[PDB]
Design a binder for this molecule. Structure first.
Ligand SMILES: C[C@H](NC(=O)c1ccc(C#N)n1C)c1c(F)cccc1Cl
Length: 261
């Protein structure tokens, strides 16, 4: 079961607050609701939390607790000191090849874990890749794409597979996440968002659906050839042409090991 937490256990998407738990220290509280009583929801919510709490691995964030109070509902998640991946890439300092390589490996590990549990992320992107004080990463579902009830209770398209652009009814598959990961590889080397010279959303969506992809040229820092190859394979228009995360890991780990570790 999930840990039940109380708002009075604390000191000083949704209302996101760095909160100091009076016993366990710094955590992140995502208060998803404040308003009229709605106890009818409760059961479901609790259940959902438990389900989502079974997803435990070094490379995914932990649900530390839930607050289920009269008209106040909160998810409490571990605190990731360095914030999201894009924030980390965009700070004054910098990162060796080896470290960006490790970040990629840890992303692969996390996604392989989720897929091994039968869980499709659906919204993998740098905002959902959080970084600890030691530059190790954990994948998160901050937009609550998989927490259906908490989402109900309660938006870049740059990393979304083209089969979902202008088709919201198509079901996502593991390959949806593999595409997202390809654009993440790009962003890790460009240190910024793709498509900066797109005309506008409509035309850009149509261009991506017709095969346009992030500009490999706008990567001006060094990116290993096999990571360029990898991102191009993972963003193939045909989802069937994209590899699985196990296939990805079984190529990437020894490359990281033989050239980057
Ligand atoms: C295991 C991880 N859990 C959280 O992302 C999570 C835990 C606590 C909170 C909050 N708030 N989140 C978003 C998680 C899921 F549960 C479901 C789908 C993807 C991922 Cl990465």
């Amino acid at each position: 079961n999930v840990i039940k937490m109380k708002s009075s256990d604390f000191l000083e998407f949704g209302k996101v607050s760095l909160a100091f738990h009076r016993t366990q220290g710094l955590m992140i509280m995502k208060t998803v609701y404040k308003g009229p009583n709605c106890i009818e929801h409760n059961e479901a919510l609790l259940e959902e939390a438990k389900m989502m709490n079974r997803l435990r691995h070094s490379r995914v964030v932990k649900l530390l607790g839930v607050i289920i109070e009269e008209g106040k509902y909160s998810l409490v998640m571990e605190y990731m000191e360095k914030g999201n991946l894009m924030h980390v890439l965009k700070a004054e300092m910098s990162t060796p090849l080896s470290v960006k390589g490790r970040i990629i490996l840890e992303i692969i590990e996390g996604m392989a874990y989720l897929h091994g549990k039968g869980v499709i992320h659906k919204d993998l992107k740098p905002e959902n890749i959080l970084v600890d004080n030691d530059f190790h990463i954990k994948i998160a579902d901050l937009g609550l794409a998989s927490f259906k009830m908490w989402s109900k209770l309660n938006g870049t398209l740059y990393y979304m597979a083209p089969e979902h652009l202008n088709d919201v009814n198509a079901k996502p598959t593991e390959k949806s996440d593999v595409y997202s990961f390809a654009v993440v590889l790009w962003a890790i080397f460009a240190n910024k968002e793709p498509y900066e010279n797109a005309i506008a959303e409509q035309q850009l969506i149509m261009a991506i659906k017709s095969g346009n992809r992030p500009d490999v040229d706008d990567i001006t820092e060094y990116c290993p050839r096999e990571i360029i190859s990898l991102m191009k394979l993972c963003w193939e228009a045909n989802p069937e042409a994209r590899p699985t995360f196990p296939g990805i890991e079984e190529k990437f780990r020894p490359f990281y090991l033989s050239q980057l570790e």
